[PDB]
């Protein structure tokens, strides 16, 4: 029932789209496992990133974009709704002005659009998780 | 021919021991894949770490120890012998005073012993790599 990780899926997004991910960190929070979700402009892994969401479980979350190969202004959050050793459900909704990140049904992070979500062609979910579900509305 | 990752093996070390790892990052350096090698005091993942070696490919290496659950003084290196998109051979040798880390046959990092290497009971190799070989002399 596990999906391969790194997980790559071609995707198209617009206002109203939701990306839902169900997974579990591979190790305890003391070990600082990571989760990364990247919305790419092309199927290639080295392409630009419209939205980069990286969790360091139990510590912090960083968000950014990678434009013409360069990381832009990093946004950091210490909000940590993820629970040690538990399965999580993460949903990323495309709103007119921003992305809204729900964790286990709780609004947890937002990121204003820097590039139109229509530029997205691929989503990659990777780092230290097992993945059971991935869906795009 | 691939080994499972995270990879955990019971181990005993002393002066003269060598831990050899052969693997490949799962993604390009632009994506900053990580490699982590931890020498633990017990088979449990949450146990103390005598030697923590973490690579952020193309950026930096950090080394530390985790004693009674707390990270101690971090050591950082910008030395980056690892090559983008290539298979690497990493060897960690236990010398009387320190660990010596060879990357593709080149001495690349050292870390003075903070705890006797005889305290090690397990080695864990994890993060964003595929692993083809793991050996302890």
Asked if A125 contacts A37 with a C-beta cutoff of 8 angstroms, the reply is: yes
Classified as helix, coil or strand, B2 is coil
Rounded to whole angstroms, how far apart are CA atoms A47 and A60?
A: 25
User: With an 8 Å Cβ cutoff, are A6 and B26 in contact?
Assistant: yes
Determination technique for this entry = X-ray
User: With an 8 Å Cβ cutoff, are B127 and A126 in contact?
Assistant: no
Domain ranges of chain B: 1-137
User: With an 8 Å Cβ cutoff, are B45 and A27 in contact?
Assistant: yes
Rounded to whole angstroms, how far apart are CA atoms A119 and A68?
A: 13
Classify residue B27 by burial, with Cβ atoms within 10 Å: 0-12, 13-18, 19+. middle
Q: What is the CA radius of gyration of chain B?
A: 14
User: With an 8 Å Cβ cutoff, are B46 and A30 in contact?
Assistant: yes
H helical segments located in chain A = none
Resolution in A: 2.3
Asked if A79 contacts A1 with a C-beta cutoff of 8 angstroms, the reply is: no
Distance of CA B79 to the CA centre of its chain: 15
Rounded to whole angstroms, how far apart are CA atoms A57 and A82?
A: 7
The CATH number fitting domain B1-137, selected from 2.60.120.200, 2.60.120.280, 2.40.160.100, 2.40.10.10: 2.60.120.200
Enumerate the β-bridge partners of residue A122. A10, A40
Rounded to whole angstroms, how far apart are CA atoms B57 and B82?
A: 7
With vertex at residue A19, the alpha carbon angle to CA A64 and CA A115, rounded to the nearest 5 degrees, is 40
Interchain CB contact of B43 with A (< 8 Å): no
CB neighbours of residue A114 within 10 Å: 13
Chain A residues within an 8 Å CB radius of B27? 6, 45, 126
User: With an 8 Å Cβ cutoff, are A46 and B26 in contact?
Assistant: no
Which among B28, B30, B46 is the nearest to A28, CB-wise? Answer: B46
By residue count, chain B amounts to 137
CB neighbours of residue B9 within 10 Å: 14
> Closest approach of chain A CAs to the CA of B31, in angstroms?
7
CB neighbours of residue B104 within 10 Å: 14
């Amino acid at each position: 029932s596990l999906l391969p990780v790194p997980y790559t899926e071609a995707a198209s997004l617009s206002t109203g789209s939701t990306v839902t991910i169900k997974g579990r960190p591979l190790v305890c929070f003391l070990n600082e496992p990571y989760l990364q979700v990247d919305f790419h402009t092309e199927m290639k892994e080295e392409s630009d990133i419209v939205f980069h969401f990286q969790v360091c479980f139990g510590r912090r979350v960083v968000m950014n974009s990678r434009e013409y190969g360069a990381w832009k202004q990093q946004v950091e959050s210490k909000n940590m709704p993820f629970q040690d050793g538990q399965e999580f459900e993460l949903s990323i909704s495309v709103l007119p002005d921003k992305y809204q990140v729900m964790v286990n049904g709780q609004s947890s992070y937002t990121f204003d659009h820097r590039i139109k979500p229509e530029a997205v062609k691929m989503v990659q979910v990777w780092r230290d998780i097992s993945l059971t579900k991935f869906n795009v509305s």
